[PDB]
């Protein structure tokens, strides 16, 4: 009673050392009621996951952490309103009205007082203010199953990090002044990789909210479309494993699982429609197989890499690339031709390793 009347924050710690755990939790729940910010309430419910009740507290932390991410992007919109228009303005002068600075501050003012449920967080905030990333987190927490809606969210997230392909404004060579940040082909990939990996880390192996084959097939197509018009000078910032390493290095997706998601991407997708795109995705696939050959350790793995299906895919991929390469060896330039000739010698070595790991069974 004395601490609950004078120091409520010492009160729950004393009750916890007295092993009165359910009373410490009932003081901490009343901190999370009475508290003035969202931060105090996350701390108080986090203690109710260091002490049924635990799962209710962990759900309140879960909603409150996405509710903080909604507040942060609303204050970013208030601080940087010139960017939150200029990233969108590129394709049309359709000035859809910039959000009411009173209503955003009323939203923030209420988001900082009380935790909301997942459907109120989705509807009146995340969907209202076009927060597709925070909408996708709410779909994961809520186990929402509309695979088409999730693919549209993933597309709109990829098409928020990739800047749209610059149209033919004129070479009026006297424009000396403007430090308008030329985002590198590195820097676009660096932002997009971070956007994919850091969302994947909370979700995987949820194939509904992290649809790996779609994220690959659209991400590689969007970096292909962005890079196609670039100079061969900028097509030297692009890592051939830009997405494929980070999905292993951070998201912990096995290189064996990635190899057949890339076989599915090449077999199912619109990659068969254009030579330059089929050369691109087949190059990523063979650099992903080059990663896998450096991770293969056991006799069991060597005994899988020598399977008929893997060997026959590698020989089909080499035959396909080698056919298209000699179709284009009359139109390509004398660096890019050599770039593809030095790739072919890797693919022929990769097929030789799938064959040596096969006949490592006659001894």
């Amino acid at each position: 009673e004395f601490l609950f009347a004078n120091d409520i924050d010492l009160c729950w710690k004393v009750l916890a050392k007295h092993q009165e755990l359910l009373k410490a939790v009932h003081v901490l729940f009343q901190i999370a009621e009475r508290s003035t910010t969202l931060d105090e309430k996350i701390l108080a419910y986090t203690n109710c996951t260091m002490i049924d009740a635990y799962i209710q507290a962990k759900n309140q932390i879960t909603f409150a952490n996405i509710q903080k991410q909604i507040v942060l992007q609303l204050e970013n919109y208030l601080n940087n309103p010139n960017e939150s228009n200029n990233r969108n303005n590129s394709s049309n002068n359709n000035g859809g009205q910039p959000f009411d600075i009173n209503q955003i501050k009323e939203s923030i003012s209420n988001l900082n007082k009380t935790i909301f449920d997942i459907t109120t967080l989705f509807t009146d905030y995340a969907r209202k203010y076009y927060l597709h990333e925070q909408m996708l987190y709410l779909c994961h927490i809520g186990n929402h199953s509309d695979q088409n809606f999730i693919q549209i969210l993933w597309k709109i997230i990829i098409d928020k990090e990739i800047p749209p392909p610059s149209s033919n404004l004129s070479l009026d060579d006297n424009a000396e002044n403007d430090d308008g940040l030329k985002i590198s082909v590195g820097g676009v990939i660096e932002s997009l990789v971070s956007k994919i990996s850091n969302i994947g880390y909370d979700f995987y192996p949820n194939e509904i909210t992290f649809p790996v084959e779609f994220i690959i097939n659209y991400g590689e197509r969007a970096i292909f479309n962005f890079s196609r018009n670039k100079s061969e000078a900028e097509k030297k910032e692009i890592s051939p494993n830009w997405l494929t390493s980070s999905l292993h290095d951070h998201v912990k997706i096995d290189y064996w699982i990635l190899v057949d998601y890339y076989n599915n991407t090449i077999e199912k997708g619109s990659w068969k429609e254009e030579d330059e795109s089929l050369i691109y995705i087949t190059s990523v696939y063979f650099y992903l197989v080059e990663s896998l050959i450096n991770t293969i350790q056991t006799a069991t793995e060597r005994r899988l890499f020598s399977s008929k299906q893997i060997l026959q895919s590698l020989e089909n991929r080499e035959s396909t690339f080698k056919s298209i390469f000699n179709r284009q060896r009359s139109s390509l330039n004398q660096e890019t031709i050599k770039k593809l000739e030095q790739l072919l010698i890797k693919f022929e070595k990769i097929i030789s390793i799938s064959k040596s790991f096969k006949d490592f069974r006659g001894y």
Binding site: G96, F122, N206
Partner: peptide, 25 residues
Amino acid sequence: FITKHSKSLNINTTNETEDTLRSLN
């Protein structure tokens, strides 16, 4: 994030398009 006792997000997304999710109308 998954918990076995989250509230399911019982929304009807079947009327959303790439247009209605990209535009300010």
